[PDB]
Amino acid sequence: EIPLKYGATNEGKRQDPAMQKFRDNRLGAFIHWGLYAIPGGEWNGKVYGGAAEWLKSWAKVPADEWLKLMDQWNPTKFDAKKWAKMAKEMGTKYVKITTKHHEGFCLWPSKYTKYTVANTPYKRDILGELVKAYNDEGIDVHFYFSVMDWSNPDYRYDIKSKEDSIAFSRFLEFTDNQLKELATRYPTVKDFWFDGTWDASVKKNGWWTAHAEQMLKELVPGVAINSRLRADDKGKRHFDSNGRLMGDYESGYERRLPDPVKDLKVTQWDWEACMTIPENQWGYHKDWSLSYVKTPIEVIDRIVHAVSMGGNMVVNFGPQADGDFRPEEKAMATAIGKWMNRYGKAVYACDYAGFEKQDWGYYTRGKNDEVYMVVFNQPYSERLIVKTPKGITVEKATLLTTGEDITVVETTRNEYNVSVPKKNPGEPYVIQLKVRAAKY
Ligand SMILES: C[C@@H]1N[C@@H](CCCC[C@@H]2N[C@@H](C)[C@@H](O)[C@H]2O)[C@H](O)[C@@H]1O
């Protein structure tokens, strides 16, 4: 067992009310909005296929020229109340907002740099408007923050000289300052989600990552901090040199998910996944025909998958430069909202059920030991196999929407055939099981 000063703090899952809320929420939205929304993946007449928020990198644009996009930042159609209504209608219980992406442009008027919304034609504190509007709908607000900053010349990718160390030390102070500023300007913030912490410079400064976590927790009671921030004494990221999770929840599942049979270890800690609608576009890209775009059901499948393994899911949106959402994203939010309004008893405040995975879909477990079968793949056999853990029996099955009774036939010790509904629901659907544990 290795000695560590900057390794894991928490033993298991936090069980204070603020973390229980973080968890019970389950479904969130991600907002990526920054200067990248203006070119929308096109630079100097060339459309790049890579992630639009990385266009500065793909098109090799220098900082001074990239940040000159500030002069066109004037989202006339922006309306924070509209945004919050859209999130409410989607059924999202929280929103994660890009306060500052890699480009360094801040969506709040930071006093620690000139590359902020204050020095744009628009001028207004976009972040503060969003915080207020989402909080007015009862939606928690989480802050995405990129440590890596392409606008600050003191940033370093690695520490290869005493000059690199000096510059980077200044950079970390600048970062602390921005963070303290965010925490105190917007004290309803529930989470900081760090990105851009993979460079060797950061891995070599584990002490700073632990310090940032302690500092923010002192400033914001009950705040959650993601594992991605954290590096230990040895530069091991997410989980420390003793394999213990750092931060409050695991945050590595980006555009992919743990395997439902092979990655059951994830059920031992809190975790959150994120995803994109296209293959890899977080910021607004003007041409979505360049990669596969997920359908609503494909998105709903990933949401439920996450919850079935004890994790949250955050679906991403990349608003237009004008401050409105593109029509594909409006259609997505409305379709997810419709399905959650009907079946969201199986999602909100649900967790891992402890049952062996079956082909038809996923199980989730409610707060009162309800076991929901969320069916995505309808068997031609008309029978949904349910294999119970030791000592567990199924006393009843009920179609969630209609209350109708569903026949349960015992086929072996520990296994049943739960019939499909008499009328095919025509969409992914929920059967609620009543289970009993012998003297869950
Ligand atoms: C949440 C998403 N994170 C950003 C993509 C991060 C890519 C991470 C890759 N892995 C590192 C080790 C680097 O090689 C970097 O390319 C996206 O722009 C979104 O903000």
TrEMBL record:
Q: What does this protein do?
A: Alpha-L-fucosidase is responsible for hydrolyzing the alpha-1,6-linked fucose joined to the reducing-end N-acetylglucosamine of the carbohydrate moieties of glycoproteins.
Keywords linked to the UniProt accession:
Glycosidase, Hydrolase, Signal
Domain (Glycoside hydrolase family 29 N-terminal) ranges: 1-345
Question: What is the recorded name of this protein?
Answer: alpha-L-fucosidase
For this protein, the Enzyme Commission number is: 3.2.1.51
What does the similarity note say? Belongs to the glycosyl hydrolase 29 family.
Q: Which residues form a coiled coil?
A: none
Q: Does the keyword Membrane apply?
A: no
Which InterPro entries does the protein's record reference? FUC_metazoa-typ, GH, Glyco_hydro_29, Glyco_hydro_29_N, Glyco_hydro_b
Q: Which GO terms describe its biological process?
A: fucose metabolic process; glycoside catabolic process
One Pfam match, by short name? Alpha_L_fucos
Site entry (May be important for catalysis), positions: C274
Sample GO molecular function, one term: alpha-L-fucosidase activity
Task: Answer whether the UniProt record assigns the keyword Signal to this protein.
Answer: yes
